[PDB]
Every structure is written in structure tokens, then in C-alpha cells.
Amino acid sequence: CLQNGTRLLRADGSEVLVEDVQEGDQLLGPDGTSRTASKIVRGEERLYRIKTHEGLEDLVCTHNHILSMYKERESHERVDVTVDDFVRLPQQEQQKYKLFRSTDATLLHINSIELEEEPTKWSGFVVDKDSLYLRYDYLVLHN
Ligand SMILES: [Zn+2]
């Protein structure tokens, strides 16, 4: 699940805050096709903040959120990993995993991932098809 205030793309390209996503809403998939959101859930807890080397917005999500990543050795493979599992990996293994944006480099390098000191509100849902959808800046997100 994602911190409230995360900016996503509706299927028509307009922006929607993650907490404004309603049952049945249509979001944008990484291939440009539609995705349907369902099972809206909300909570409040200490989230993990992920900052990249590149100048894009931090990603703030729950400990059980699934990151969709490319892991080194074409040269990379697609891997899904929860924040918990990723946080516990040695940093030398952490190299190899990169976040990614939908191809119109598109790989993003994580500089830090840290548990935040105070709880904040989050919103989550499930998405059909490949469970992937787009942040407003085309960062590829998983359910
Ligand atoms: Zn979610």
C-alpha cells in the first residue's frame, strides 16, 4: 500500500491521488492498457521512504508493499519483492535491484530506504491483469 498523497494516473492520463481511487476505477498500466482497482483499504502506520539517486519523487509505502524491480544479471530480469524482504538484504545484493519507469535511462537506482519515525495514512487496493500501474511520473508500481 502507498502513502496518501501518492499521485497516480487514471486510464485517460489524468492524475488521481491514491486515496481518491474508488472501487472499479480505471488506472493506467505500463503498456498503456487499462487496469481496474478494487478492494480499497486504508490504514495508518510507520511507512518506509525510498529515495533514488535520480531526481524523482520519493516512494513511501508500507513494509509489506511489493516493489516491481529489475535485478542485474538481457542484463536484467524482472523481480517482485516486498519492502520487508528487500530491506533485509545486504546492501551488496541491494545494488542489483532497480526501480523502473515505463519505456516512453528508465532504470532508477535506490539511494536509501528507511523506516519513518512517525505513522502516516496509507491507501491500498488490488489491480487486475499484471497487477502493475503507473505513478504520475511513469514509475511502475505493483499492488
Ligand atoms: Zn497497493
Author numbering: 1 to 73, 90 to 120, 133 to 171
Question: What do the study's own words say?
Answer:
At the heart of the spliceosome is pre-mRNA processing factor 8 (Prp8), a large (approximately 270 kDa) and highly conserved protein. Prp8 helps generate mature mRNA by coordinating critical rearrangements at the catalytic core of the spliceosome. The intein-containing precursor undergoes protein splicing, a process that excises the intein and ligates the flanking sequences, called exteins, to form the functional protein. The intein is also found at a highly conserved site at the center of Prp8 and thus is at the core of the spliceosome.
To further understand the mode of zinc binding, we turned to crystal soaking in zinc acetate. We determined the crystal structure of the Cne Prp8 intein in complex with Zn2+ at 1.85 Å resolution. Compared with the native form, the complex does not show significant conformational changes, as is reflected by a small overall RMSD (0.17 Å) between the 2 structures. There are 6 molecules per asymmetric unit cell. All 6 molecules bind 1 Zn2+ at their C terminus with the terminal asparagine (N171), and 3 molecules bind an additional Zn2+ at their N terminal C1. The Zn2+ at the C terminus is coordinated by the main chain carboxyl oxygen of the N171 and 2 water molecules. Binding at this site induces an alternative conformation for the main chain peptide carboxyl group to provide a ligand for Zn2+. This alternative conformation is not seen in the native structure. Zn2+ binding to either of these 2 catalytic residues prevents Prp8 protein splicing.
